[PDB]
Design a protein around this ligand. Sequence first.
Ligand SMILES: Cc1cc2nc3c(=O)[nH]c(=O)nc-3n(C[C@H](O)[C@H](O)[C@H](O)COP(=O)(O)OP(=O)(O)OC[C@H]3O[C@@H](n4cnc5c(N)ncnc54)[C@H](O)[C@@H]3O)c2cc1C
Ligand SMILES: Cc1cc2nc3c(=O)[nH]c(=O)nc-3n(C[C@H](O)[C@H](O)[C@H](O)COP(=O)(O)OP(=O)(O)OC[C@H]3O[C@@H](n4cnc5c(N)ncnc54)[C@H](O)[C@@H]3O)c2cc1C
Ligand SMILES: COc1ccc(C)cc1NC(=O)Nn1cnnc1
Ligand SMILES: COc1ccc(C)cc1NC(=O)Nn1cnnc1
Ligand SMILES: COc1ccc(C)cc1NC(=O)Nn1cnnc1
Ligand SMILES: COc1ccc(C)cc1NC(=O)Nn1cnnc1
Lengths: 588, 588
Amino acid sequence: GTSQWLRKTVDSAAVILFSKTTCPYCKKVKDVLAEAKIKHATIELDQLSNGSAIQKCLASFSKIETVPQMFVRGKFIGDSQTVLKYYSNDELAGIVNESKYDYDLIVIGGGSGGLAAGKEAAKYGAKTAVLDYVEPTPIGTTWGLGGTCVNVGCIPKKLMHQAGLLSHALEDAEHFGWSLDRSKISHNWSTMVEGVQSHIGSLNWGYKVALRDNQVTYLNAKGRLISPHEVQITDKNQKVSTITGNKIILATGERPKYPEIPGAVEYGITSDDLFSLPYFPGKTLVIGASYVALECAGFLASLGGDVTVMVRSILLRGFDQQMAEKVGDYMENHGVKFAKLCVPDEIKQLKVVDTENNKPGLLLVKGHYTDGKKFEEEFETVIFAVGREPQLSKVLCETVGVKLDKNGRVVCTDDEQTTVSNVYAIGDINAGKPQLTPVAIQAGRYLARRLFAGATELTDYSNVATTVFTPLEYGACGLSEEDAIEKYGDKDIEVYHSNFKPLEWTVAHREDNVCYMKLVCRKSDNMRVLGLHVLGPNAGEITQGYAVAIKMGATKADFDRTIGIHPTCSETFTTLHVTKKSGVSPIV
Amino acid sequence: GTSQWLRKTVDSAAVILFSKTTCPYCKKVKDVLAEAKIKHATIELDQLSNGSAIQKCLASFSKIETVPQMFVRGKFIGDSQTVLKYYSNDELAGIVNESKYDYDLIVIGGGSGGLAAGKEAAKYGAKTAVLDYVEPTPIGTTWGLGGTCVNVGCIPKKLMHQAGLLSHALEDAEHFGWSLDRSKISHNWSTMVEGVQSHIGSLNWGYKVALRDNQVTYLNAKGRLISPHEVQITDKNQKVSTITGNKIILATGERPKYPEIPGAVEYGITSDDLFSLPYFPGKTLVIGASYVALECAGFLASLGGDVTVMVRSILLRGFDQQMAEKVGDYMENHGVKFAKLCVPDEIKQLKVVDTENNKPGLLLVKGHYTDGKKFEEEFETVIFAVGREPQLSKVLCETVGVKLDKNGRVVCTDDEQTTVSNVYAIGDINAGKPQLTPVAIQAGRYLARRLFAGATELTDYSNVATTVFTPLEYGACGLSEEDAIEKYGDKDIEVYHSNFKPLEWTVAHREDNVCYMKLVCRKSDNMRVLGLHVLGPNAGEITQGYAVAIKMGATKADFDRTIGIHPTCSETFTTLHVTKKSGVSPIV
Ligand SMILES: Cc1cc2nc3c(=O)[nH]c(=O)nc-3n(C[C@H](O)[C@H](O)[C@H](O)COP(=O)(O)OP(=O)(O)OC[C@H]3O[C@@H](n4cnc5c(N)ncnc54)[C@H](O)[C@@H]3O)c2cc1C
Ligand SMILES: Cc1cc2nc3c(=O)[nH]c(=O)nc-3n(C[C@H](O)[C@H](O)[C@H](O)COP(=O)(O)OP(=O)(O)OC[C@H]3O[C@@H](n4cnc5c(N)ncnc54)[C@H](O)[C@@H]3O)c2cc1C
Ligand SMILES: COc1ccc(C)cc1NC(=O)Nn1cnnc1
Ligand SMILES: COc1ccc(C)cc1NC(=O)Nn1cnnc1
Ligand SMILES: COc1ccc(C)cc1NC(=O)Nn1cnnc1
Ligand SMILES: COc1ccc(C)cc1NC(=O)Nn1cnnc1
């Protein structure tokens, strides 16, 4: 019990001190380590339930039961007297740096999870390297350190979402008494892109500064695991070399897919290219129906574009389908066109992109509908958003022994361990886990603490809240209504729901019964809230706080006994009463 | 136990049917009652755990133990055979309208609480009257049905707040690429007031329709309780008369105070006047420091006004003072002037209000600072926001026996009962309760269910969340930091905090380290969250969901194990780690 925890902690920590807050011999050792700039983890035995048990188990490694005790990479180094002996004889630095490996930790992948993992490990004295390389897109787009979210994901996409939201603010401002005329204002794509890219560039630089100031080695190099402890690296001159590490974290992410049709790679683009595109896309076709597809179509339309979405089957597969249909209905009423039950067959080039005068090309898209009829129409830009995939064959040699699943993602235990004992996987490549930036960050930081500080806390992957940043935003936490009915049966599910209107929409003359919210509850478990859903402005700010209550097992009675804040959209959750079974209208 | 509940329920229900869902004799009685439009409460004995005890206890009133049993105003009417007999002999209508009083319920006050109470009572067959009268302000301002929030409170002030926020949206729009020029755009006060007042008028009308459609009698008349069951009414022609009711609910709210100085009533205004003023206030002095004072000064400055606030002692007395000071610092950085440690001595008229040309007048304000130096300055408008108070001497004869406290509010039990057993009080006049619209609504609806449908649930007044809608908003739930320390001692309190920057503020070049959040926790109670505080955009949307978790007893561990939604401001609560004791900086 306590015995096996201690063994695992000692064998894995790079530099760890067992201590008590009251002992001045411990403070004497802490001070010496700080002066020599030796980072390390510390376990305060007087602050743990069974510290007396641990203190006695230390004797199995050190043959002493007293405190302080200092270990380096699994080896007992000395008590107080012995540590100062090493310091006074100029022997300490060599002892704390001796290792079987170049690094205590190598992180392959410099994104959300990998940077979090690497920075947290370095805090406890682990010698860490972070590798990052951005393979260019087919048209050659590349970008800096920080991963998909920072450079070509959550960050630029929400900033262009905000640019779109501000067109409605301009319209609203007239009704609230401001003297502008929305009809005579236009948008400049390249001005927006310049401001977005300047912020992304501040994040690239911030991550390099953060790694330097944590003593993490950053190599802008492509890494490949060739044996459990050996990583082959290739630099910007295709210089190939090999570095070794005790623990390995795979954190390499995914990239967009293309459909296997003529012209797709040659003449279309993905979200990877959209966020630094030097010209306005113009008349645009978006192929696919994921949250990426709908978010991009949405702000392009709000910035004045002529936008079409080609849907093969349904919107937002895997999300609550009543909510997904409301999302699409709103964007169709505000100008996005939808080609339903439709897939593409080929893309033909009619004009090459005018890279001089900063203008898109021109393309002819041919496709067909699910019953047989034909699609044919011209667009200036075609954006594919038909999913994302890893390519671990680039990253990982099959002889190493790391098990993948049928989709190509890494099969892991609940502490992120692979089938190779010293290798771990986090973020989007970890099979079966929600593919989200805060998840990757929590997994990376918690894992680093278990490896190098003796921590025990695991990452909880259940009921993680989401928000889709469509022109009207959709926040959710927990089960969709159809998944709850499937799992428990229709007779055991009760659904409370209501329309609402934001107070901000009244004077602005916006729609009465379009925003909408519901709670999906289990009758036989005290009306436990299984899933929460809201369509409305600021949906992510609305949903976040409820994710804590749902984590704690909130029931409908908990929502009822809590008082609303007025006037807000969120307060409508505190007074829901119309059930779906009753048949009463949810309108207001 | 069961027997004391049953007698309380039978005595005060207006019309109540005891029933079982599986009984066709009960369905036959329900059907007759519906056809005759007889509204009534219903208790389904088969859906209660001690329904068997209640069934046998009914015999104490009816000498029978079967269902259905129908009662009217405390008297057993009959079983199935007897009710149908009364029906087909045309005697039922007269039976159910038999009463010792004109009304089962009289509500004095047509605001947030009183309207909620009256509509809910009428659903269970209580014959109900709602009285509402709006005493004009000193300059003559009056308004329609709905109370302070609807007409001169939450609704118009948040609409005017939104007009102020749109100022910054117009500014932010240029940085995100829109072609407008903020500096050439101005605001028209009367156009804003016209749109606000048109929405308020639709609320006035909607409440009158709601009372008509619930068969509630609405009397636009001033009420006075002269004995436990008699209410004297005075109509708009000064006709005086008396009506009687079984139960009385007092729900008359408060009105603004004026300081006792020369010129205040004659030449200044209050929030009651501000939301329908026909001219822009111009250069304005706000006297006071409540949330009313700061919210009003705030939107006035954003709409282009030259605004000063004169503060007796501190801002937002009774709220967390670190957050109060940050609220003030932001207002002052964006234009609002503050006259600290200062009070007014007299207001002098230099120009009368120009009601022809639609212009304010001009005033000379004289005052002094606490060290004795003098204040003297000219303003076009002076707004007093120096507190609110009930005036129950106009509502309630002293001989009735209703106890008041030192501030003139009604002393109530935790079920809203006064010292007169048939008389209840709800909303702002209920001593010691938070003075908020959703509290008054919850109190009123829960009380009507207990009086007329046999409910037992009480209103929970603890840990009610708030939001102050200053230009940068402040949301809170639970204890201030200084209150937590007073109650538990400094060593049992830990404070986690951080600055943050909304993503929307990056491209717009807004401030880096102004938004702020903290969690105030109790060490010896598993780091229980005692209070949550946040300064930033959409602070009410952010705070609301967390109020469910605090109601449930959330700890710091519950916040840590919940995952963030990215990118949002609210997610910063899920990763807090810097403590105040550590002395580490909270900047990002
Ligand atoms: C358009 C879009 C919008 C999104 N919006 C959101 C949102 O609003 N909220 C949210 O939570 N999530 C969002 N996501 C998802 C989020 O971006 C991912 O979940 C997250 O980036 C995954 O982090 P990661 O560490 O697993 O991988 P990544 O962040 O992709 O980082 C992996 C890194 O490793 C590099 N790499 C790959 N192979 C190698 C190699 N052999 N050697 C070295 N380096 C290598 C990659 O180039 C990359 O830099 C969005 C995604 C997309 C595509
Ligand atoms: C400027 C301002 C802003 C506010 N903003 C917010 C906010 O954002 N959120 C929030 O939760 N709360 C807010 N409040 C508080 C909220 O308005 C009150 O808590 C709420 O209105 C109290 O409701 P009530 O039912 O107790 O009384 P009221 O709503 O005041 O209703 C009482 C009614 O009874 C009438 N009446 C009085 N005497 C008699 C009589 N003798 N006979 C007949 N009728 C009579 C009154 O004229 C009035 O119509 C604000 C208040 C103010 C002043
Ligand atoms: C693929 O589904 C859509 C695609 C585009 C859009 C615009 C909407 C939908 N949703 C949808 O069908 N809406 N709806 C109409 N009547 N019932 C539901
Ligand atoms: C006619 O207005 C009323 C409406 C309803 C009622 C019950 C009374 C009045 N009496 C009235 O004139 N109010 N008043 C006071 N100071 N100026 C005007
Ligand atoms: C009455 O207090 C204020 C009044 C007006 C304003 C504008 C601000 C405050 N707050 C305040 O004192 N801020 N501060 C400065 N250094 N420590 C705290
Ligand atoms: C965004 O700041 C402004 C810009 C322009 C102007 C003319 C005003 C503001 N001030 C602002 O936020 N409103 N306000 C009210 N009380 N303090 C501040």
